[PDB]
Amino acid sequence: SMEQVAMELRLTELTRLLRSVLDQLQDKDPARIFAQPVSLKEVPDYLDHIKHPMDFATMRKRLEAQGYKNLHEFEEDFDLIIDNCMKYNARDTVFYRAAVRLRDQGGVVLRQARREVDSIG
Numbered sequence: 001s002m003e004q005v006a007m008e009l010r011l012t013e014l015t016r017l018l019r020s021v022l023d024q025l026q027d028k029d030p031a032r033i034f035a036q037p038v039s040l041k042e043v044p045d046y047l048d049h050i051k052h053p054m055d056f057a058t059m060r061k062r063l064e065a066q067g068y069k070n071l072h073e074f075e076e077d078f079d080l081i082i083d084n085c086m087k088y089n090a091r092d093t094v095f096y097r098a099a100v101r102l103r104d105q106g107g108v109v110l111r112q113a114r115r116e117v118d119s120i121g
Ligand code: NA
Pocket: 086, 087, 088, 089, 090
């Protein structure tokens, strides 16, 4: 149908906007602490601690398969990155401190993206 295509055109535009958002969020991680999943070879007990791991590469695979239906789903995944890190790592570590910084710097990007998604529909 023509409806299904128009729907698909909007998913594709949401995907374009979220791609730009993802890039902007990932620039706030210049150390690449959150680039890739936590290694199970190097942290073998990780899944005893964290039940839903998340990272920027895994968000990128979902993004390019148009797997985010809305911004809420995308933000849930970004918060997992941050929240997992703040639980697994202690306060006085470079990892926890990197999460805090990504959260604070990410918030501004996310604020405007919500406006843009609401505004453009
Ligand atoms: Na902790």
